[PDB]
Amino acid sequence: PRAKTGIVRRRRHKKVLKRAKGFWGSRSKQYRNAFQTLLNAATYEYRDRRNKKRDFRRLWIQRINAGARLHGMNYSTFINGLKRANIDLNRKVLADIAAREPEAFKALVDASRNARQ
Amino acid sequence: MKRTYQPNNRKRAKTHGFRARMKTKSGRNILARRRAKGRHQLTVSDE
Amino acid sequence: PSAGSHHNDKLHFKKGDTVIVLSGKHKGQTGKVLLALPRDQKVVVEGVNVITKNVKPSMTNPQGGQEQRELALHASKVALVDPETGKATRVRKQIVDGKKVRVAVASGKT
RNA sequence: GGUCAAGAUAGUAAGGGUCCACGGUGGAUGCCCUGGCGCUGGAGCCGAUGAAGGACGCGAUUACCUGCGAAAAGCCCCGACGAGCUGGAGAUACGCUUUGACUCGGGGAUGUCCGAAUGGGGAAACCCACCUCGUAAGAGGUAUCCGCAAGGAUGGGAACUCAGGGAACUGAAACAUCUCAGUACCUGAAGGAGAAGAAAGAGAAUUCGAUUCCGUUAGUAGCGGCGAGCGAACCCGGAUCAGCCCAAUCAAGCCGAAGUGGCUGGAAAGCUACACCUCAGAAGGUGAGAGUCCUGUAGGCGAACGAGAGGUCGUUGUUCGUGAAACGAUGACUGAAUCCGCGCGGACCACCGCGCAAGGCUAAAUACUCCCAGUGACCGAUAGCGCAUAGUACCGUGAGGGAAAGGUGAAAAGAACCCCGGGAGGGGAGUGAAAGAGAACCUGAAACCGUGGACUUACAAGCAGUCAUGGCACCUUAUGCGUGUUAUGGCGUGCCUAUUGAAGCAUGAGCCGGCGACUUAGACCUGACGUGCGAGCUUAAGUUGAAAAACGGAGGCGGAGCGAAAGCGAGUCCGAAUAGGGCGGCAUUAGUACGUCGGGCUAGACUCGAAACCAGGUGAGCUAAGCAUGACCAGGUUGAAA
RNA sequence: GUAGGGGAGCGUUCAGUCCGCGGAGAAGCCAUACCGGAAGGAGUGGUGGAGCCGACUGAAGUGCGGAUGCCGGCAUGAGUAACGAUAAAAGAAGUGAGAAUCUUCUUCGCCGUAAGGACAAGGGUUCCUGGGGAAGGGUCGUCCGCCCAGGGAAAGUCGGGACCUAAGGUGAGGCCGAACGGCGCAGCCGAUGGACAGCAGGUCAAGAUUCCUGCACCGAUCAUGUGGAGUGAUGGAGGG
RNA sequence: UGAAACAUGAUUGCCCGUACCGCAAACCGACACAGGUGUCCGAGUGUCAAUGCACUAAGGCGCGCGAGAGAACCCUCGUU
RNA sequence: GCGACUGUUUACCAAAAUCACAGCACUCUGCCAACACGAACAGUGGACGUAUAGGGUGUGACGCCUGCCCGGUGCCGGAA
Numbered sequence A: 001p002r003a004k005t006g007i008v009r010r011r012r013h014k015k016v017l018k019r020a021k022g023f024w025g026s027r028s029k030q031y032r033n034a035f036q037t038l039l040n041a042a043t044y045e046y047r048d049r050r051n052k053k054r055d056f057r058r059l060w061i062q063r064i065n066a067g068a069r070l071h072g073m074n075y076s077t078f079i080n081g082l083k084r085a086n087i088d089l090n091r092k093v094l095a096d097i098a099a100r101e102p103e104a105f106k107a108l109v110d111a112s113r114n115a116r117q
Numbered sequence B: 001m002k003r004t005y006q007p008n009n010r011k012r013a014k015t016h017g018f019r020a021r022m023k024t025k026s027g028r029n030i031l032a033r034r035r036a037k038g039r040h041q042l043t044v045s046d047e
Numbered sequence C: 001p002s003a004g005s006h007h008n009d010k011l012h013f014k015k016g017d018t019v020i021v022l023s024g025k026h027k028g029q030t031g032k033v034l035l036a037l038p039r040d041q042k043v044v045v046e047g048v049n050v051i052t053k054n055v056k057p058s059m060t061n062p063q064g065g066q067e068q069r070e071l072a073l074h075a076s077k078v079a080l081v082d083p084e085t086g087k088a089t090r091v092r093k094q095i096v097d098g099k100k101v102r103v104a105v106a107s108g109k110t
Numbered sequence D: 001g002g003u004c005a006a007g008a009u010a011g012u013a014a015g016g017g018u019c020c021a022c023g024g025u026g027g028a029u030g031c032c033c034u035g036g037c038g039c040u041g042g043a044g045c046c047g048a049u050g051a052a053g054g055a056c057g058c059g060a061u062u063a064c065c066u067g068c069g070a071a072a073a074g075c076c077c078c079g080a081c082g083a084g085c086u087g088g089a090g091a092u093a094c095g096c097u098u099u100g101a102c103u104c105g106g107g108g109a110u111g112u113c114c115g116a117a118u119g120g121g122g123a124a125a126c127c128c129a130c131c132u133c134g135u136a137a138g139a140g141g142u143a144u145c146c147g148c149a150a151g152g153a154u155g156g157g158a159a160c161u162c163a164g165g166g167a168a169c170u171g172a173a174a175c176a177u178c179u180c181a182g183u184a185c186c187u188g189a190a191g192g193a194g195a196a197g198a199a200a201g202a203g204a205a206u207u208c209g210a211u212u213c214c215g216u217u218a219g220u221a222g223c224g225g226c227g228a229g230c231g232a233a234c235c236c237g238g239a240u241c242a243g244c245c246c247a248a249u250c251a252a253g254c255c256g257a258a259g260u261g262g263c264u265g266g267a268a269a270g271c272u273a274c275a276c277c278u279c280a281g282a283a284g285g286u287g288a289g290a291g292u293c294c295u296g297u298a299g300g301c302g303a304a305c306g307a308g309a310g311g312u313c314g315u316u317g318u319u320c321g322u323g324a325a326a327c328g329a330u331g332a333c334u335g336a337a338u339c340c341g342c343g344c345g346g347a348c349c350a351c352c353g354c355g356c357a358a359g360g361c362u363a364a365a366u367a368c369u370c371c372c373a374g375u376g377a378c379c380g381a382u383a384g385c386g387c388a389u390a391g392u393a394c395c396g397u398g399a400g401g402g403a404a405a406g407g408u409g410a411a412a413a414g415a416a417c418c419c420c421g422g423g424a425g426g427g428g429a430g431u432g433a434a435a436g437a438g439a440a441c442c443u444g445a446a447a448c449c450g451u452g453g454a455c456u457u458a459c460a461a462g463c464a465g466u467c468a469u470g471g472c473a474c475c476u477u478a479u480g481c482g483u484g485u486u487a488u489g490g491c492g493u494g495c496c497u498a499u500u501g502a503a504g505c506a507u508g509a510g511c512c513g514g515c516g517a518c519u520u521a522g523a524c525c526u527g528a529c530g531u532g533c534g535a536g537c538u539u540a541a542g543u544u545g546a547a548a549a550a551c552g553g554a555g556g557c558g559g560a561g562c563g564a565a566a567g568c569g570a571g572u573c574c575g576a577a578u579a580g581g582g583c584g585g586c587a588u589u590a591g592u593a594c595g596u597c598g599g600g601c602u603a604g605a606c607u608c609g610a611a612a613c614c615a616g617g618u619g620a621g622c623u624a625a626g627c628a629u630g631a632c633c634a635g636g637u638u639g640a641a642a
Numbered sequence E: 001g002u003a004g005g006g007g008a009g010c011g012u013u014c015a016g017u018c019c020g021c022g023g024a025g026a027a028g029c030c031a032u033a034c035c036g037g038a039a040g041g042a043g044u045g046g047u048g049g050a051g052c053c054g055a056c057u058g059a060a061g062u063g064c065g066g067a068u069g070c071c072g073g074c075a076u077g078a079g080u081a082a083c084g085a086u087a088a089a090a091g092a093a094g095u096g097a098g099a100a101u102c103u104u105c106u107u108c109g110c111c112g113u114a115a116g117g118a119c120a121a122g123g124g125u126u127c128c129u130g131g132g133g134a135a136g137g138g139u140c141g142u143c144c145g146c147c148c149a150g151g152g153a154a155a156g157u158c159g160g161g162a163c164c165u166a167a168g169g170u171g172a173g174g175c176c177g178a179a180c181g182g183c184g185c186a187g188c189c190g191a192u193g194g195a196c197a198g199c200a201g202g203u204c205a206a207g208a209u210u211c212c213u214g215c216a217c218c219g220a221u222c223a224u225g226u227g228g229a230g231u232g233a234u235g236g237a238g239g240g
Numbered sequence F: 001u002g003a004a005a006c007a008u009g010a011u012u013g014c015c016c017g018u019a020c021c022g023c024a025a026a027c028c029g030a031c032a033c034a035g036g037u038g039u040c041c042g043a044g045u046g047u048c049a050a051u052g053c054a055c056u057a058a059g060g061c062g063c064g065c066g067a068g069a070g071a072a073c074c075c076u077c078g079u080u
Numbered sequence G: 001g002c003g004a005c006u007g008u009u010u011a012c013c014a015a016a017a018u019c020a021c022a023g024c025a026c027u028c029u030g031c032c033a034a035c036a037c038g039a040a041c042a043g044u045g046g047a048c049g050u051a052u053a054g055g056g057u058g059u060g061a062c063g064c065c066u067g068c069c070c071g072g073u074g075c076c077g078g079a080a
C-alpha cells in the first residue's frame, strides 16, 4: 500500500508559520525562511533567558550605586557595609527601596557606613 | 542559409513509403513493430 | 456508467400501467405510464409536475414563454398497484391461459 | 490675558511595514469512480473460401467514434425476450413494431480498393490489360513452388518453445585465458503449447528401468591466471505415465421468500413501535445507510440451432579452462566386425558387470498469457498502463520519441423574463433544500495580486531575530502568566553541504505546493530478543479439503573427535617411542523449528549523475562526391595559330 | 556533543477487531490566548456536503528545505527591452457600438532585369460570394492568408499514362552464399530526355490551347463510291 | 472477284493534372522571420554599348504600432 | 619572403606559405594484369583499357643542377 504525504506536511508547515508571525517579509510567509529564522531565534531565546538574568542584575546595581552616591556613599562601600552589619538584603529589593522608598534608603545608608568604620 | 528539409514528393514516397518499407526485411519488421505501438501513422504512404 | 446497468436494463412495468410513487416528495400518487425508458431506467407518470422555461427561440414564438409539464423519473420510486389495497405492492408472475403470462400480488391480478 | 524670549513635545504619509477582515489567482487536500495494476483459473491460433491491418465509402443533417460494405449504422432463417425502438450523440423531421419489433444467443447470405496480393505494372489503396460465358449491365479465371490428379505451401501472432548465428559493457578492484553468457540481439520453423521419448542408459546394489517437471541430494562431489568465481549426478520423495511400428456438460433465458405505522428531513433506505422471510444477510441502484421497493442472490428449470561405429588432425559439450582425457559431437583425411559378434564402465590391461548404434511416430504432466473471468492488508487523477483513454496532439526526412487531460444536481427541473453592454460579463427573478451547485459548474490549501481597518513609519546603519520596558488597540480556549501592534534598549555572523577551520567574497537554492532515496528475494550465513517441543527439534515438493487447515519423513539441523588420507576412535596425529597441536573428560552447562530485528553474502542493493562499450536498424529531401540527363553566362576589352 | 551503537516512543496509510459518530451534518480546509517532556493531540467557533474519529493488533511505496533534484503554478527583473529594415505619408469622404490602422477619393513617397508578369517544386481551400471578431495579427481593428457557411476547378490536340528508352532499379531459368540474403543475360520499371493532332477571340464574383462563338487538325470503326492485286513482322537496312 | 492507296459523309474522343499562393505572409527557415528556392518574359529616356547606373511606363507597393521631443550616449551619413 | 600560374580548402573564429596542378622521378604490373569492394571458385571496378597502358609513392612550372655514406632497417638477388 502507498501512503502519500497527504496531510502531514501541510500540518508541520502551518505549525511553523503560526510560530512565524510578526516576522518581516518572507520570514513570516515562506516555510523555509520561517523555520530557519526560528533556528536562529532558538539560539536567541535560550541565551537570552540566562542573559536577562544578567541584565536585570546590572540594572538593580546601577540604581543602588546611584542611591549610595546620592548621599556620599559608593555602591561598593554601601553594599559592603550592608554585608558588614550582615543586613542580608537581595539587591533587587535594594533597588526597590532605593528608588521608591527614600528615608528607608537613608537609614540603610547610615547603617552601612556605621558598620564600616 | 538554406535548410535541411526540402520536400520532394517522389523522394519522400520512394524512400519511406510502403512498397518501399515492405521491399526489405527490416521494413516488414519496422511495419509490424509500429503496428503494435498502435500507430495511426503507419508509414508516409498513410499521410 | 448506465442506470439500467445494475438493473439488467429491465423494466419491471410497462407503458400504460398505473403507478404509485414510493419514496420522494410525491409519496403515493397515481399515474398512468406515459413514457417508460428502460436503459436509462427513467419513466413518466402523470403526477410529477414542473415549470420549464424554453428560452428565447424566436421560431416558434418570438419571445420565450414557459410551460407547465412534467419531469420524468426513476423506476425505483415507481410502484405497480394492487387493485384491492393499491399501495406498496410487489409482484408475482403466474400464467393465465394458454401461453399468456401475467402478474399478481398476494391476490391477483393487474 | 497680549507681545517678545528660552526650552520641550504633537499631528500630516507620497509610499511602505506587522496584524486583521474580505475577495482574486491557483488546483494541493478530502470524497468519489467511468481507468488501471498484479495473482489464480479458464480459454489459445487466423489466412489463397483473401488473414492480421488498412484505404475509400454506406446516414434525412455526418466532422470524430462506432457498425457496415455499392444488398453498405445493415439483409434472410431459427431460438430466447415481450414493449418499446430509431448507434455513441445528448438534434429535429421521417418512421418501425404485440402478424412480436429493439436487444440477446445461433447459423447463413452480400463484403468495393489496398495489403501473403496473386493476371502485368506501381510511389500500398492506384494504372493498363488478355481469356471464358452474357443481350448488355455483369461473373469467373489469368503468381510461384510440391504433385498424375485431388490437394498442400506463401503471410500474421504479445510472449512460451526449438534451431542456424551469436555481442559487448561488466567482474577478476588494471587485462588477455576467464567471467559476464549461449545472456542481448538477428534469423529459420512450429504449435496451442513445444521440446524431449521407448536405453550400445544411468550406474555399483550382480539395483533401477523412455522422457519432460518439481522437491531433494547440494554450494556436496568436482572446475579454475586452483584467482575472481563456476557447480553436477546417482539414490531418496512427488507430478504424470505408453509405449507403437518398420528395413534382408458449458453457450441465450426463464422462475424465484418475506413490512408497515408514526418521526426528523429538501428527500427514508436512517430513528422508532410492532411485524414477517431465510437453502435467499454477496452485491449494486433508489433524493442519507433498504435482508422484506428494484435488479438480484440460495434454489429450481433451461432451448430448435450451439459448443465439448572405430581411428588421425582442428574443436567443442556437459562441474570438463589439454589436465592422466574417458564418451558423445561434427570439418577434413580414413570409412572394421554382424553373434565363438558389437558398444560402455573417465587414460590404458585382464577380469567382471550394465548394454543391442547404423530407421520413424508418440498423449500425459511442463512454459507462456494478446484475450475471458474471479479475487486483493494493489492504485484512485504528479498515483494507477503512456492514456479515466491517445500512441492521438506535438517533435522527428526517418527509425523512432510522445503529453496534461476527471467531478453542476437527487433529478436539467440547464435559468422564460426585466436590467447596464455591440459583447463579454454581471445584478435580479424563477427552479432547488442549497444557485454559500449556474454550466470557466465538489471540496478550493500555498506561493502570488489586490480593497478596507487597526497600530506604526520620512536624522536612519539592518541575517531582520531575540529579550526587557513604555505606548496604543482588542477581549468567543480571552481581563492576565493576556492577545495584536508598536517605540526605546540590551544582545545578536542566513541554512545546508564540504572542511584543519564558514556569515563567509566557498557549494546548492526565485517562491509554494505535490512526487522524491537504506528495499526486496533466498527456505543461504551468523548473531540478539522471543516462543513451541526439548536429547531431542523439523519438514519440502506434493495430496486432499478450502468462507478453514490437515496430511505429507524425502531430506535438514543436533548426535565424536583427530589425520594429508587410508583409517583409528575418547581418543587421534606427527614419530620408533618421547615431547607436543588438535580433542574428550572437563571443577560445569542443549538442541532445533518458527518468528521480529541488528549485520553478512550473491542480484540493480540507498537514490541521482557519466565519458565511454556492443548488437540490430534508420539516414545522401543537409553536406561530400559518382552516374544519366537538361539547363544557364548583359555588355565590353585583348587580338594566338593558320 | 560530530561520525557511530544503544533505549523509549510521536504521525501516515492499508488491514483484522471492538467502542462508536454522522444530512440537527463526515472527511478535508480556515482562524485561535488550551493540553502533553517532544515528536503531537484536544475544546469551540466558520467552511464543506457524505462519509469518518477512537483502542488493540498486523503489514508498509511511512514523515523532505535542500540533490545546478522532477511536475505545476505563481512571483523578481518591469510597466523596463523590443513591436522585425529610415520605400513616407497627408487631407477629405464613408462605415461602425467604437477607426492613426477597414472602404471610397484626391494627391505624395518607393520598386521598375522588380519590390512587374508567367511557370515548376512544395503547400492544400489559403481562390470567389455572403457573413463573423474569441483567439491568430507584435498596436488597432468594423479588417485579414484567421472563424462560419455556400459556391469555384471542365481538354481527343497543353502536361503525364494508354508508346520509347538513360543512369539507376529490377529480373523466371542462371551464378553464389551459416540464415535473412548477395549477384546476375534477355525482359521489365524508370524522365531530367525521344515521340506527338489547334489556333484566334469572348466571358462567371471565382475556370480556360478545356467552356462558349468562328474557322482548323489527328487516330479510330462503318458506308457509297475510285477499287481491281497485293497487304508488308517478334527478324533485315535506312532514318531517328 | 475486294489488296493496298484515296475522296467524301457518318461516327467515336479513355485516364488522372488544371482553383489559388508560387523570389514568398500562402513552399523550406518553430514566426505574417532583412535568409534559402530552379527556368521563362522583363518597356522607355539618357548613356561607346549593356540585363550596367540615374529617372520612369505597365504593374506592384509605402514592408500591420503610433505620436511628439530635439540632452548624454549609440548606430549610418555630410562638411570641415 | 612564400608559392610558379587559373584553380582548392577548415558549412558556423584560420583562404594562406595548405591542397591540387602540368612536369620530372623510383618502383610495381604481360591480362582471369597488378591493385580494390567483397558470405563468396559468385559478380564487379581496374577496362570493353594492353606496357606510348594501368597502380602506388614522392617532388611540384621553367632554367643551370641534384654531391658524399649500402654499416643498421627496408628492398632486389645469391647459394655452400
Ligand SMILES: [Mg+2]
Binding pocket: A054
Ligand atoms: Mg550569574
Ligand SMILES: [Mg+2]
Binding pocket: none
Ligand atoms: Mg495613496
Ligand SMILES: [Mg+2]
Binding pocket: none
Ligand atoms: Mg470511419
Ligand SMILES: [Mg+2]
Binding pocket: none
Ligand atoms: Mg427473429
Ligand SMILES: [Mg+2]
Binding pocket: D081, D103
Ligand atoms: Mg429487451
Ligand SMILES: [Mg+2]
Binding pocket: D110
Ligand atoms: Mg453485390
Ligand SMILES: [Mg+2]
Binding pocket: D117
Ligand atoms: Mg497486383
Ligand SMILES: [Mg+2]
Binding pocket: none
Ligand atoms: Mg573490457
Ligand SMILES: [Mg+2]
Binding pocket: D171
Ligand atoms: Mg575490471
Ligand SMILES: [Mg+2]
Binding pocket: none
Ligand atoms: Mg512464422
Ligand SMILES: [Mg+2]
Binding pocket: none
Ligand atoms: Mg580430440
Ligand SMILES: [Mg+2]
Binding pocket: D316
Ligand atoms: Mg571444451
Ligand SMILES: [Mg+2]
Binding pocket: D327, D328
Ligand atoms: Mg569420441
Ligand SMILES: [Mg+2]
Binding pocket: none
Ligand atoms: Mg485532486
Ligand SMILES: [Mg+2]
Binding pocket: none
Ligand atoms: Mg497519470
Ligand SMILES: [Mg+2]
Binding pocket: none
Ligand atoms: Mg448574459
